[PDB]
Structure formats: structure tokens, C-alpha cells
Amino acid sequence: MKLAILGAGCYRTHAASGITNFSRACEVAEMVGKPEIAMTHSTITMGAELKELAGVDEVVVADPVFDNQFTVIDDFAYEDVIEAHKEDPEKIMPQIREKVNEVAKELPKPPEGAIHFTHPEDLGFEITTDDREAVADADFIMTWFPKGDMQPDIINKFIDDIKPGAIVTHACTIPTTKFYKIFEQKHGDLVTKPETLNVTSYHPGAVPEMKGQVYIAEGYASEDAIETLFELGQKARGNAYRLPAELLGPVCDMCSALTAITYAGILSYRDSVTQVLGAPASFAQMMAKESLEQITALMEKVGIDKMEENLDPGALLGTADSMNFGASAEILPTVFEILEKRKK
Amino acid sequence: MKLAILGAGCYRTHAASGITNFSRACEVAEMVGKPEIAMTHSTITMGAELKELAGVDEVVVADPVFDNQFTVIDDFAYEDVIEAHKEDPEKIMPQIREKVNEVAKELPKPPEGAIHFTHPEDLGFEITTDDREAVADADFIMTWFPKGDMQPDIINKFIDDIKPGAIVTHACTIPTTKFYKIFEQKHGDLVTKPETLNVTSYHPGAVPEMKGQVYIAEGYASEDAIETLFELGQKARGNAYRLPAELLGPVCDMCSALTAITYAGILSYRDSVTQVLGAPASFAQMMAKESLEQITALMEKVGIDKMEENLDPGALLGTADSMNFGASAEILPTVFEILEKRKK
Amino acid sequence: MKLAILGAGCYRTHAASGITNFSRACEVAEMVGKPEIAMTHSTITMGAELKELAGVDEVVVADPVFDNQFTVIDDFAYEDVIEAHKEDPEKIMPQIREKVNEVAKELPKPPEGAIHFTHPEDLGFEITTDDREAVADADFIMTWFPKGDMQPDIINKFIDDIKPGAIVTHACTIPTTKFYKIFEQKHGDLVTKPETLNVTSYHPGAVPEMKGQVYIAEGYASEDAIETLFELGQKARGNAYRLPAELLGPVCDMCSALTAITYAGILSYRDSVTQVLGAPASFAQMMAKESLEQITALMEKVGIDKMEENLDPGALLGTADSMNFGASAEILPTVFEILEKRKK
Amino acid sequence: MKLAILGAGCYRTHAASGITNFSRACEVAEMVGKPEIAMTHSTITMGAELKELAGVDEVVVADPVFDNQFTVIDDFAYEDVIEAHKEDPEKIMPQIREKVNEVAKELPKPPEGAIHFTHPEDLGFEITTDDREAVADADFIMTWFPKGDMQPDIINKFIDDIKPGAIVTHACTIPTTKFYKIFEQKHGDLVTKPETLNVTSYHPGAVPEMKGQVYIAEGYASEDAIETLFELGQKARGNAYRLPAELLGPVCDMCSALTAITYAGILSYRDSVTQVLGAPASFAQMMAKESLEQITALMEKVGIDKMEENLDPGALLGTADSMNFGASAEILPTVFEILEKRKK
Amino acid sequence: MKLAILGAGCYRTHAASGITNFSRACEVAEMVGKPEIAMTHSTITMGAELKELAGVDEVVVADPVFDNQFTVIDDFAYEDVIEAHKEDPEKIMPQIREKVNEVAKELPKPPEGAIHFTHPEDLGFEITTDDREAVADADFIMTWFPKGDMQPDIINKFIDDIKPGAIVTHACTIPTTKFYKIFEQKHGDLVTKPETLNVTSYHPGAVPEMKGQVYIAEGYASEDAIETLFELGQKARGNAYRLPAELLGPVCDMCSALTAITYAGILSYRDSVTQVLGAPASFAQMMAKESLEQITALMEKVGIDKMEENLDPGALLGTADSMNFGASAEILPTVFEILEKRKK
């Protein structure tokens, strides 16, 4: 198949964050014996994986930046980075960040400037400034566009050139629904033919060069399209996750921590009710729904910063302790230390 | 297993309707060589099926009416009814209705009176006036209670006597949700133990003696409980249907016709979009959702009797004709004759 | 009155669709003895109708394309097309499509290029590149803008130049609500004066040159404005439909087929309940609401492509058959063939 | 036609209120030359009006109280009350209240006791203890039942005896929707035939003997049924109002004052926007919707007693003053005195 | 602290409205002995107040217009305007409007043209064309941007240059929620750091030079940030109002009149119920909620222009009169004159 990456991306924001590395990129480079992969970042790493590990036959990277100031840093040798990542990334990352940060002081933001460490061409990739040429014959188009009102306009330029049934994906810069609306149009006429694209996501849930993982939004694409991408991503990224499009944010955004906590609570609570009390899962759900809707409603009603003034954390210590059995007992003791500490 | 039927029911309303027969009851009676089944009705027929065809070991029929005026009509011989149903039920049904209607003129309504044609005892069934005794050791309790505020009070008397994990079912007299709330309680304390019952439905979707079919509401019971009842009902009734509890009304109530029409429309429309246009099913759903929500909203906004004044049926002839392809072409020509006839 | 058409449109997409003709445009041309109308398309046809058949005194066509590559094809004589449309449009349409398609291969998309067959000037129309000049003194402004984020920006340039109380319309490229928000502003101050425009639609529900019909969205404009346009459109297009703004999509979009089916179902079902059962229309509505809300909810809950796994089409055959009377009997037999074919 | 009143009612609560009179009852009695009408109350007055002024041929009053302690007070002569009401009801009402209050100290509440001043029989009415006998052949059934869970059970006893198409009404003791559900049933089967009744209201919006007015809930009954009752009530009560069932509470309950204020505001505000600003009524509605939804949301969010802490009444004086023109200027000056007085 | 005003604004629309003056600007100028303030307008007045009366140390005005045609009118002497505003603004405002209107005939709209009367530099302000330079080190950024899709793009250029914890405000051109979304981003990754800004409003609720008042939207910023701005605005504008972000529109938009009316109604109605009837405020709220939701629902259901056809204004006169006591009696008599006049 033909993969058309639209957006090479820039490492400035990764280096600026001060908390990333090339652990995955390195791991891949060592697996396939191509040192140049070690310092690839963003879609280049993901493209590297799909070509080298998933068997994607043709890769094309499209980005206006290639004609603009596409900056490649040759200061760090690939092998040094690989060997440093083998024991402790921090033996070379602070040095890497300062150079990127220095380059980024004057360098314009994308698409006028991009900080990379590997030339896509070296990975056998075809580079292009124009997106239409890239999407031509592409079975899988991977978008890595900027956050903003430009994604619909960026897309409209190559939408007619998209092959029927192609898998089109988005990443952390845009919600699935919003992205899907650009391609599929509700209002029209007999003349305007609906698109037939399989819209999904190829969301890293982190900087692709640091972690090997992908999140694939379900609900807009054919199941075959989801299976095809799921199988590609499982091979390319190592850890692929299929999930409803509505949960992509909850799981990949800064709220991930609360979704995690809450989900553990729900699953634990449910199991204590079905396995210890023996009640049907429908009773556990009715109870769960009560908790969730009300505590969320309270946070909306008075504000997340005024909950304690309305519901003292201590009020739950006197009642929840009786439900401390089954799976819930794996999480309640911790939860109680937190409410003990916050009680009025 | 032990089956505890709570409510024998009465044939007055069936005879009064003027449109029912004993076709199923007859079909069963002939299958098992027990003529007495031919004129059984309501739960007696269903119990007859479960004992004779599903292998239910113990059947108990509980109804206060047994101590009251439980009337059995011996005017029609079982074989005559069977032979009449073999070619045309109407050769004996008009005669049957008049006798039931005559008996029903003075006879009190249940639980003070009940019109039957077969003595449950003859089918090997245990009869009881008290429900607690009946539900004792019952693996499957089949409720056939009257429509009204009495179902919670009728139930509260034997709820503590219900065996853990028992399958409790309801029929056309009450919605699943409403019925489920009687057993499972949201508000309580450590002292009040939640019930562990598998609440579902054993809804005939007609008078049990006329049609062999059952509707089993999903979402409140364990999947095992649904499978067990599904397998019993498939054997006992012949045609069993598993469906979400929310659709039990839509499918079994007087609205069945509109659900049917609409569902065919949705499935046809979807197929024309996925198979002819090639668009993803998500696009078909987005379009469908548009139609359904808006036409329903219009009916609510101006009233089902004032739609034509606001949306002329003719307005759709000029636009829908272009979508007349694929599966939709099996239903649009008919649909067009109806809008042609109703256009302003 | 003065009509200001903003957007001449382009025939490429019509020709590309492979399913359109000039039947209406021809019919008009023959009615008014002006052959040039036969090959007009989009707003030119509609403007032709309003000037020639509705008595609109002054027509102005505004489009940046006139200064750009506005391409007119002189390959087909008007009379040939008229005579061909008199018996079978397909005797000349395939030939017409290939030429348009060939012209459209290199020609840029609007507003840089437009494929027409008649010079607006020949119809007595005033052509302009600038919209402000066009809307000046316009009693009726007919927008035919592109689908996208540009409509608000296109509009803002001439909004102050719009005459108070003018009728402003939109077509298939934008929803009424969205379009209305561009003109009328909710947030402001004493200084910002609310607009007084009569926002509606002049939606062809097809390519204007093929069908004579218009859809006029109600709810945003004065009733006088709706009556004025309704009377113009009835004369100009032949078949004008007044309808709530919320139904414009449902009726004119690809969902038209399902709205049609559903509406017939509702009207048929209602009539069987009020005319055969005698129940009040309020009972029919309560039942209808049950059907619609639940079947729509099911499609949303599990997905339009997974309904059968949850509600077997066959489940409705056993129940709906009893409601097969009255108006509903005109649609149920067909509906049953569809569910018979799809039953699990 | 035949009118079946179900519930005679009791005057204790009227006398206890300390604020009622017999002004209407008196006015009727004088109009028809029947002094006995002067001291009738509740449904007896309304029945008196329908028989004497609307031409209702047969009146039947059904109430279990007739067999129980139905108390009639002969202490006040009809003519004295009429003459007293001719100039000032308070010349005899305080005396009337004390006697009723004294009688009501020991007398049981209905249906065991009822305080009246006129024997229904004297008005030519047929009195009955049993409701089934009363509703037989009744074209118009007027329910005057107690507030509570008993209305469905009271109704179920005579529902089968109700004539098809009969007009069934309720008063201040029950909401229309709730009342309608008792008669019309959503869940059933082919056997259970839907009711065909025309459910509405004959709501006095006060004690019938004090004011001549009726409120008739629309949306559940046939338009003919509403017209028939509207025409009866206009003749019988003098001031009849047809209105959507949803507004019966808003208009007749203690909230009437706020509905009144608000409605005047909406109508005034709308007129200033359409008549002075010239904006379309759709703009006035968009603005109105903003106001109403938000101020209501604020009251729900913080509580009606904490609004000032969140939105100072004074905040609106600085902004609303600019909108003080047109119809709104009839209500804003007053409204400003109230906000001036309440500003923080 | 450092104040960075982004947008100087233009007086054309103020002069065009025909209903504004410089009363506040004058009042300030006289208070601080700086005549030049008298004819300042928009943010210049507000900046003048914050520097002169609130003690803001550094003011910066950023606007692309300064490099473009920034027009200053020297035709009216400051003192003449001050003396004219001392007794009657209309002795000089008509003359001022005509000159501004004449200048505005050819002058381009902002940011290409701006009509002012005082050079910001004279007030000690730093003027700049570039926003990034202005926001640098700004503790309080005051946005005065145009209404439209440009605010997010205008903002994105200086967002990274914004100091952590800065107070960012918007005015009548944009809703708080919409404005807040530009800065705070829900979707992202570990790399994209959430903003830490205190988003609020500095909404004049009129032209700043006419009235001394500000509205500060609560719910998005820290309470400290709201207190800081509240205290600045109270000193600078004289009348500052803290209110939930949801009410900013309701209170400052053209709907202000209806919010005012309604709010007075709610507060009056509540007080009659709690103070006269003695019922709890929860009962008043339940009643209020009934009124508001239903009357709003009716306006949505049939349209603000068709309410009378469905609910006759007269219907409330017969019922509300009984609730005419307590605080409500301050508003009901007026309200009754309006319903008397509009009754069918």
C-alpha cells in the first residue's frame, strides 16, 4: 500500500517540554539496523515504523516546510543517542534540548520552519511540498496538521484527489468529529457526491519517538478499515488501541489521569457488586450512574474549586467504608487516605 | 427447574376483542397428544409449552381467583376446536366468543372471576392461591399481573421468598423499567441487601394461545439468564426474540406498525447509501439521524394531525426521487404513491 | 423589484454527476420564446424565470468569476438541446457532459473558473464583479455561495450595503441557521444596530435547470416576506414549497429518502389509529413518539450497521401484522417483504 | 347532551381560605331567576350554569358523600346572600365562614363529609353514589376528584362504562398529562383496545362560585371536542380560555403571577424590537430565548434566594435603560424602581 | 502593573448610532484635570481611567491602525465639549456626529481607518502596531477586537508571548466561552502546555466614554484575578459588576430589557411567596421554574409572534389577580394594564 504523510512536524515543542526522549525511535532503529531512525521524530518515526516493520511499500512525506527553512541538526551522532538511550536518555537529552531551543529562538514556526535530525529522503521516503501529489493513490493518508481553523482549508485542497475508501487519520491536534466533518458532508444535493473515506485516528498519545503506541478512533470508518489500521499499528507502534471516537480525548488528553482513576473505580465497584453482593451488573450500573451523574453535576453546579464547601470529603468516610469489599477494597483504602486528609 | 406462574389470566378480553383464536394452543396440543391444551389460554398455554416442550419439571400456577369464581366452560369439546383450527378457526371462534361474552356479562373481573376452558390441574400443574408458596424454589417466576399500581404491592408480598438468581419475567401489562424497579432498589443502607434477580420479559406480543412467539427484554438480567430463557422460549413458543428492554414497547405495543415501517426504511436507506453510493455506514447514520430527529421534532412541535399544514407530503416527491436506488427502491415507489395521494 | 444574484455558479459538478439535464430550462425557454434560456444553469435559470415569468423588473448577477476565466461553450445550439429535451434529454446530454468534463480538466474551480453555455448579459441581466454594487437597492438578494468558512466573510463585505427588510436567501451550500447567524447578531451593544433582513431560502432541491421547484425556509423572515417569495417562486419555478427551516435539510439533503419513507409511515399509521381505531390523534402521537424515539435511539446506541444484531427485523413481523389496517395497510405489505428478507 | 359530574366537592376549604364569595353563583341565580343557585358551590355552580345557561339537557351529580354525611346549611337565606353580593359580599361572607368553619371542626373530610348550602336535587339534578351509573350515556363527564394517588383507582371503576368520544375533564387537583395517562394507555396488546376519549380540562382557575371563567387544556382532545366545550363554557362560565395543556399549571397555579409578569415582558420586549428597531420577530425570539434560559438557569444553579449575591439587580440598570423604548417603555420604568430598590 | 490594550477602536459606529455622548470621559477629564480625556473614546477612555484613577503604572495601546490612516479630529476644543456636557451633551453632539459621519464616508473601516479625537501618546500611553511587543510583561491585557472569525487568529500571534497568570479580557464583540476557548485548549498532549491565564471580561455595557461601568465575567479566572480587576474597575469605571460569564450576554446585549423585567418579576414573586405566604424559597423556586420553563417553551414551540393565538394575554388576568400581594404588588398592576390591552 501507499502511505501519504501530510505534515513532517517540528521537534521544538518536544524539546521545549523538557520531558521527552527518543526511546521508541531508538528501539526501532536497533530492531531494523538503520541508525538514522533513532533521531527521527513525529510522523517520520511513525512512517519509519510502517515502512520498516509493517511492510508499507511506498511512503510519501508532504509538507510545505521542505521548500521553506527545513532545519536538520547534525550535532548528535545517531549511535551516541542510541547508546545513551540504552541506559539513560538523560545522559544526552538535556544537551539535545538546548541545541533545539537555541535553533528555535530565531527559527520561524511551521510551515516556515521545522527542526528535525534526520532527512526523510534517507529513509527511502519521497518528499513533496504539494499534498495533492502525495495523496494520489494513497491507501492510507496520515494527517499531522496544526491545531486551528486551517485544517479544513488545508484538507479541501486535496480532498478530490483522495482515492475512494482511503484510510484518513488525524492526531492530537483535532477531535475526530471535527476532523470527520471536513471530509463527510451532511448538506448537499444529487450533484455533490458523498465521500467514501474511512476516517479514523493514528493518535500516538505521546511524542511518537518516545512511546510505541497508537490510538485508533472507532465509529466513523468501516470495520475492515479499522482492522487494517489496527493490524498495521500493532506491527508499527507495538501497542495499538481500538476505541470509540468519543473516548480519544478522555484517554489521550490531559484528563487521562481522571479517566484512568474513574474507570478503575467503575470496574472495581462493579466487580464488588457482582462478585461479592451477587447483584446483577444492571444494579451495579444503576448505582454507578447515580454516583457519576451527581458528582459531575455538583462540580458543574458550584465549580470544581468549591466542591468541599458543599460536599465535605469526610461525609463519604462514614458511608463508603461499608462497601469496602471485593475488587473495591484494592482502591478504597487509598481513596480513604485522600478523603481523611481533605475532610473539613 | 421449577416454574412459578403468578396469574392464570382471563379469556373475557380475548373473546371481547373478536379477533383471536387458539391456533398455537391447538398446534401444541396436537404436537404433544394432549387435547386439553387446545383451549388453554394466556399463561396456562405458555406453562403447557414449557412443561411439555421445554422440559420444565415442575409447574405451579398461583392466582387468588382459584379460591374465587374460577369459571371453566365445558361447552366446546377440545377435539372440535382442534379440528376447526386445522382449516379455519372462524368455524368455531364466533360461537366461542358469544359464550364467553355471555359468561362475562355478570362475572366479576379478575381476581374475583376468570374465564378458562381447561382446569390447570389436568395439565399436571399445581394450583395455589398464595404467591409466596409458589415462588418458593422457583428458578423461573412468570408474572402475568394486572395493569395498574397493584404490581408493586402484589410483588412485595413474595419478594423475600424469591430464590437468589431467579429469572423473573413480566408481560404486556407493565414496562420493563417500571417492573425492574419493584425488585431492584436504588436507595437503601448496608442493612437492606440488594436483590440478585435476573429481571426480563416473557412477552407474547399477542394472546399466547393464538401465536407461538416470545419477546425477551435484555439489559437487566445476566447474559446466562437471557440465554437460559431464550433457549426455553425458543423450544416452548417456537419463535423467541431477544431484544433491548427499550424496544419491547416499540415492537409489542400498538406502535409496532410504525416501528416496522421506520426500521425497514432505515435498513433500506442505509443499504442504498453503503452499497450503491459506497459511503461509510457512519455517513448513512448521520443522514438517518437528521431525518428521524427532525421529522419526529416536527410531529411534536405542531402535532401529528397538523404536519401536512407545515410540511406538504408533496415536498418530498421532488427531492427523494433522486435517492430511489439500491435497497431504498424496494420501498420508495410505495412511499411515493402515499405522498402523491396526500400532497396539498 | 430588484433581484441581486450573488454567484453565477458552475456547471462542471452537474456534468460530472452524469445524471442531470436542462428539462426545466428548456421548458422555460419554450414558454417565453427565448432559446438562450435552454442552456442556462444554476442561478441564471432561476433569474431567467424570475425576470421572464415572475415579473422581476431588474436582475443583477454578481460574481468575481466574470473578471476571471468565465467560460461559455458555444458547441451546442440552443434549439438542438430544446428539441432533444422534448423527447429524450439523453440524446444530447452525454455529448454535453464530455465537453464540460474536458473543459473542466484544466479550468480552475470557482471563483477563478466557471462553465456556462449562455452569457447572462443576453438575458438582459447586469453583470458585476463587486457584490456591494449588486445588493444596492436589491429587494431580493439570492446567494449561491460556495460551501465553506468563506460565506460569512463573503457576506460581511456587502451586509452594510443591504437595504432594510430585504429578502436574503441561501441554497444547498449552507444550513438556514448557520446562514441566518451571519446577518443577525446576538451579541452587541446600543451602537451595533440589529439587522432587519428577511432571511429565508430559495433552495432548488436539485439543479435549477433540471427541475422547476423551490424550497422556502420558514421561521426567520416576516410572513409577508415568505408570502412574497412564495408567490414569486410559485410563478418562477412552478413548484414552490414553504417549510420550517429545520426541515430544509431533512427534505433537500441525501436523507430525503428516509424522511419521505418515515413521513409516509407516520401519516399512514396516524390515519389507521384515528380512522379505524377511532382513538384521538394525541394517542397516535404518543404511540408514534414511542416508535421514532426508540428506533432512532437504538441506531445511535449500537450503530446503523449493527441494528439487526440487536433487533431482528423478524421480531416486528409477529407484532405489526395486527396493526395492518386502515391507511397503514397501503405501506405494511411492502414493509413486511423487507423485514421477511432481512430476518435473522 | 348528558353531563355526568363526578364529585360534588366541599366548601370547608373555601370558607377556611377567608377570601372567597358567591359573586358568580349569585350573578347566575339572578340571571335565571333561581335563587337556590346563589349559594351553590364548586361543580354544582358549574352544573347549574351548564343546565340553565348552556342548554345541557341532563345533569347527574355522582359522589359517595350523598350516602355519607352530606351537610346542607340552611342558616343563610338565598336572597340575603344575593342582596349582600349586589353591593359588598363581605357584609355576609364573614358570617358564612364562621358557620362553615364550626361545622367543619367535627365533620369528616370528603367523601365522608361535605359542606353545601343547596341540595343538588332542587336544581333538577339527578344525584348518585355510584359513578358507573352516572357516566352511562354521558357526552361530557366533569371530574372534580381529590388530589392524590386515588384518581386512577377512582377512574378505573367507570372507565369501561364511558361512552366512545366522550369529553372527559379534570380541574385544579391533577395535571392534564397525569389525568390523560389514566384513560389512554401506551402499553398493551391487540386485545386491549385504546380508549377514544376527548380528554381536556374544565378548570375554574378559582372557586367556581366566585368567578365566571374556565380554562380548557388543548393537545389531547379532538378540535371538535375542544370547540364544543369551548362554546359550552363560554355560555356557562362567561369567560372561557383555550390553551395548551402545558400552560394550564403556569396560568392557573400560584405561579400565575410570574407567568403574567414574564408574558407581559416578552410581548412588550418583542414589540419594541419589531416595531421600533424593525428587526424580525425571529431576532426578538433569539434575544428573548437568551434572557429567559439564562436567568432561569441562574435561579436553578444558585437558588432563587441567592440570585442577588450572583447577579446584582443594579447590573441591569446600566444596560437595560438603552432598550427603554416602544412597548417595553410601558413596563421598564416600574421594573427599574424594583431593581433600584434591590441593588447591592 | 502593565496594561496592554489591544485595539484602539473607532468612533464612527458611535457617531452613526446618533445616541451617544462623552459624559463619562468628560467627568474623568474634569476629575483628573486633563482636558484631553474628554474626547477620548472606547479603550482610550478606559485606559485613561485605569492609569489616572486606578494607578496602573504602564499603559500600552496596540493597533495596526496606527501605521494605517489613524484619523484625529481637531475641530472640537476639549473644553467646549466638557462645558457642553456639564449641562446638555446635545448642544455639541449633533455637530460632532456630522463631522465623524463625513470623515467616515470615504475612510476605510478598521484596522485600515479609525476616527479618534485624542492622540493616545498625549495621555502618556505607548503606542504600537505589533501586539506581541505590547503583551510582553503585561499583567492585564485588554482586548477590543472586531466581531468575527479573526479573534482566534489575532490572538494566536501573541499568545506565547503572554505572561503566566495574566488577566486577559474581552468586550461586547465576543462571548466569554468563545473567547476563553482561544486561550485554553482541551485537546493536546504532554508537549502542549495548558495556558495559565485568568480569562475574564472588561465589558462596558455601553460606549466607555458615555457611561462609567464595567461587567466582569466570573467562572474562568482565579478569584484573586476577579478581585484584582473588580477593584481596578470599581476605581477606573466607578460602577463595576461581577457576574457569571453566562449572564454577560443576557445583561449586556439587546435582551437586557427582558432580563431586567424577568429578574424583577422573579425577585418580586419570590418575596411575595416567602414573606406573605411564608412558604419556603424552595416552593417559590419550584413555582418560578414552572412559569419560566413553560412560557419560554411556548415561545419556542409556536414563535414569539404567535403566542397570543395560543395563550390569550387575558387568560392571566383571571388567575394572577389572586397572587397580587407582597413584593409582586409593586409589579402586577402595571403588568395587568399590559395584559388588559392585549387580551383577545
Contact D76, D82 (CB under 8 A): no
For chain C, breaks with the C atom over 2.5 A from the next N come after: none
The technique is X-ray
C233/C202 Cα distance (integer angstroms): 8
Contact D320, E257 (CB under 8 A): yes
E58 has which bridge partners?
A: E2
Q: How many residues does chain C have?
A: 344
Please tell me whether residue A169 adopts helix, strand or coil conformation: strand
Same domain membership, residue A111 and residue A167:
yes
D259/E292 Cα distance (integer angstroms): 7
The answer to whether the Cβ–Cβ distance between B335 and C260 falls below 8 Å is yes
Q: What residue ranges in E64-124 does DSSP mark as E strands?
A: 69-72, 113-116
Q: What is the CATH number of the domain that holds B292?
A: 1.20.120.1300
The answer to whether the Cβ–Cβ distance between E191 and A17 falls below 8 Å is yes
Here the cell at position B205 is: 406480543
Here the cell at position B269 is: 436507506
Nearest CA in chain D to B203: D189
For residue E153, the chain A residues in CB contact (below 8 A) are 149
Q: Which stretches of C215-280 are DSSP H helices?
A: 223-237, 248-252, 256-271
Residue type at position A230: F
C166/C169 Cα distance (integer angstroms): 10
Q: Which residue bears the cell 354544582? A: D44
Same domain membership, residue B84 and residue B224:
yes
C12/C107 Cα distance (integer angstroms): 10
Residue of E205, E260, E291 lying closest to D339 (CB–CB): E260
E164 preceded by a cis bond (ω within 30 of 0): no
E91/E100 Cα distance (integer angstroms): 16
The last residue of a domain, from among E186, E219, E254: E254
D191 close contact with B: CB closer than 8 A: yes
Residue type at position B298: L
E204/B250 Cα distance (integer angstroms): 55
Here the cell at position E163 is: 505572561
Contact E200, E168 (CB under 8 A): yes
What are the φ and ψ backbone dihedral angles of C28, each rounded to 5 degrees? -65, -60
E249/E173 Cα distance (integer angstroms): 11
The last residue of a domain, from among B233, B254, B275: B254
Question: In angstroms, what separates the C-alpha of B292 from chain C's closest C-alpha?
Answer: 7
Q: Output the 3-class SS for B15-75.
A: HHHCCCCCHHHHHHHHHHCCHHHHHCCHHHHHHHHHHHCCCCCEEEEECHHHCCEEEECCC
Around Cβ D239, how many Cβ atoms within 10 Å? 16
D69 has which bridge partners?
A: D113
C158/C197 Cα distance (integer angstroms): 13
Contact C48, C61 (CB under 8 A): no
| All partners of chain C with 3 or more CB pairs under 8 angstroms | A, B, D, E
Contact E48, E118 (CB under 8 A): no
Contact C198, C166 (CB under 8 A): yes
For residue D255, the chain E residues in CB contact (below 8 A) are 269, 287-288, 290-291
C-alpha triplet E94, E96, E99: angle, nearest 5°: 110
Contact D126, D58 (CB under 8 A): yes
Same domain membership, residue B117 and residue B66:
yes
Contact D76, D97 (CB under 8 A): no
Count Cα neighbours of D37 within 13 Å in the Cβ-side half-sphere.
26
D300/D202 Cα distance (integer angstroms): 32
Q: Which stretches of B193-255 are DSSP H helices?
A: 223-237, 248-252
C198 close contact with D: CB closer than 8 A: yes
Kind plus residue range of the DSSP H or E element containing E228? helix E223-237
A320 lies in which domain range?
255-344
Same domain membership, residue D132 and residue D243:
yes
| Residue C176: closest CA among C253, C111, C107, C232 | C253
The answer to whether the Cβ–Cβ distance between A189 and C175 falls below 8 Å is no
The last residue of a domain, from among E228, E254, E280: E254
Same domain membership, residue E120 and residue E268:
no
For residue B223, the chain A residues in CB contact (below 8 A) are none
Contact A245, A217 (CB under 8 A): yes
D24/D36 Cα distance (integer angstroms): 13
Contact B246, C294 (CB under 8 A): yes
D5 has which bridge partners?
A: D61, D142
- In sequence order, the 6+-apart residues with CB closer than 8 A to the CB of A319 are none
- In sequence order, the 6+-apart residues with CB closer than 8 A to the CB of A248 are A175, A176, A201, A203, A215, A217
* B·C CB contacts under 8 A: 300
Q: Which residue bears the cell 423604548? A: D325
Question: In angstroms, what separates the C-alpha of D226 from chain B's closest C-alpha?
Answer: 15
Same domain membership, residue D180 and residue D77:
yes
Nearest CA in chain A to E157: A109
Residue type at position A267: L
What are the φ and ψ backbone dihedral angles of C89, each rounded to 5 degrees? -55, -35
What are the φ and ψ backbone dihedral angles of D209, each rounded to 5 degrees? -70, -15
Residue of C149, C187, C194 lying closest to E175 (CB–CB): C187
**Resolution of this deposited model, Å:** 2.6
Spell out the long-range contacts of E216-221 with Cβ–Cβ below 8 A and sequence spacing 24 or more. E216/E240, E216/E241, E216/E242, E216/E243, E217/E176, E217/E243, E217/E244, E217/E245, E217/E248, E218/E242, E218/E243, E218/E244, E218/E245, E219/A303, E219/E176, E219/E244, E219/E245, E219/E246, E220/E176, E220/E180, E220/E184, E220/E245, E221/E167
Q: D interface mutation test: which of E20, E213, E256 has the most D CBs within 10 A?
A: E256
Same domain membership, residue B268 and residue B247:
no
- The rounded radius of gyration (Å) of the Cα atoms in chain A is 24
Give the pairing type, strands B198-201 and B167-170: parallel
The answer to whether the Cβ–Cβ distance between D191 and B14 falls below 8 Å is yes
Contact C196, C166 (CB under 8 A): no
D117/D115 Cα distance (integer angstroms): 7
- What is the domain count for chain D? 2
Q: Which residue bears the cell 374460577? A: B70
Same domain membership, residue D156 and residue D263:
no
What are the φ and ψ backbone dihedral angles of C68, each rounded to 5 degrees? -90, -165
Same domain membership, residue E261 and residue E217:
no
| All partners of chain A with 3 or more CB pairs under 8 angstroms | B, C, E
A23/A72 Cα distance (integer angstroms): 20
Around Cβ E154, how many Cβ atoms within 10 Å? 18
**CA pseudo-torsion sign C22, C23, C28, C29:** positive
Around Cβ A319, how many Cβ atoms within 10 Å? 10
C205 close contact with A: CB closer than 8 A: yes
Residue type at position B242: R
C-proximal residues of B, 246-275, CB under 8 Å: 246-247, 249-270, 272-274
The answer to whether the Cβ–Cβ distance between C164 and D278 falls below 8 Å is yes
Same domain membership, residue D264 and residue D232:
no
B18/B20 Cα distance (integer angstroms): 6
Q: E interface mutation test: which of A151, A254, A301, A302 has the most E CBs within 10 A?
A: A254
Around Cβ C288, how many Cβ atoms within 10 Å? 26
Around Cβ B102, how many Cβ atoms within 10 Å? 12
E169 has which bridge partners?
A: E142, E200
**CA pseudo-torsion sign C179, C180, C181, C182:** positive
Here the cell at position D201 is: 380540562
Q: Which residue bears the cell 444554476? A: C42
Kind plus residue range of the DSSP H or E element containing C169? strand C167-170
First-to-last alpha carbon distance for chain C, in angstroms, is: 62
Kind plus residue range of the DSSP H or E element containing D15? helix D12-17
Same domain membership, residue C106 and residue C22:
yes
Contact A177, A249 (CB under 8 A): no
Here the cell at position B136 is: 418458593
Q: Which residue bears the cell 400581594? A: E325
For residue A164, the chain B residues in CB contact (below 8 A) are 278
- In sequence order, the 6+-apart residues with CB closer than 8 A to the CB of B323 are B269, B272, B332, C254, C256, C257
Around Cβ C189, how many Cβ atoms within 10 Å? 23
The answer to whether the Cβ–Cβ distance between D190 and B149 falls below 8 Å is no
Same domain membership, residue A265 and residue A235:
no
Residue type at position D154: I
Here the cell at position C145 is: 455561495
- Report DSSP letters for A63-122, one per residue: -GGGTSEEEE--SS-HHHHHHHHTT-GGGTHHHHHHHHHHHHHHSPPTTSEEEESS-GGG
Question: In angstroms, what separates the C-alpha of A189 from chain C's closest C-alpha?
Answer: 6
Spell out the long-range contacts of A117-120 with Cβ–Cβ below 8 A and sequence spacing 24 or more. A117/A11, A117/A39, A117/A40, A117/A41, A117/A72, A117/A73, A117/A74, A117/A76, A118/A36, A118/A37, A118/A39, A118/A40, A118/A44, A118/A72, A118/A78, A119/A72, A120/A8, A120/A44, A120/A47, A120/A61
Residue A88 CB burial class (10 angstroms; 0-12, 13-18, ≥19): exposed
Question: In angstroms, what separates the C-alpha of D310 from chain E's closest C-alpha?
Answer: 6
The answer to whether the Cβ–Cβ distance between B281 and C266 falls below 8 Å is no
D115/D107 Cα distance (integer angstroms): 9
A8/A116 Cα distance (integer angstroms): 9
CA–CA distance from D109 to each of A342, D65, D97 (Å)?
A: 54, 10, 17
Q: What is the CATH number of the domain that holds D239?
A: 3.40.50.720
First-to-last alpha carbon distance for chain D, in angstroms, is: 62
Contact C246, B258 (CB under 8 A): no
Residue type at position E150: M
Here the cell at position C342 is: 432481512
Question: In angstroms, what separates the C-alpha of D67 from chain E's closest C-alpha?
Answer: 35
E-proximal residues of D, 11-40, CB under 8 Å: 19
D261/E269 Cα distance (integer angstroms): 9
B46/D272 Cα distance (integer angstroms): 69
Around Cβ A260, how many Cβ atoms within 10 Å? 12
Contact C36, C74 (CB under 8 A): no
For residue A195, the chain C residues in CB contact (below 8 A) are none
Contact D180, D167 (CB under 8 A): no
CA–CA distance from C42 to each of C65, C128, C171, C208, C228 (Å)?
A: 15, 17, 11, 5, 21
E287/D15 Cα distance (integer angstroms): 25
Q: A interface mutation test: which of C253, C301, C309 has the most A CBs within 10 A?
A: C253
A223-248: b (≥16 Cβ within 10 Å) or e? eebbebbbebbbbbbbebbbbebebb
Q: Which residue bears the cell 535553533? A: A103
| Residue C156: closest CA among C132, C125, C129 | C132
C-alpha triplet D204, D206, D212: angle, nearest 5°: 60
Nearest CA in chain A to C255: A186
The answer to whether the Cβ–Cβ distance between D220 and C322 falls below 8 Å is no
Q: Which residue bears the cell 408481560? A: B171
C291/B246 Cα distance (integer angstroms): 10
The answer to whether the Cβ–Cβ distance between B335 and C292 falls below 8 Å is no
DSSP letter for E203, please: B
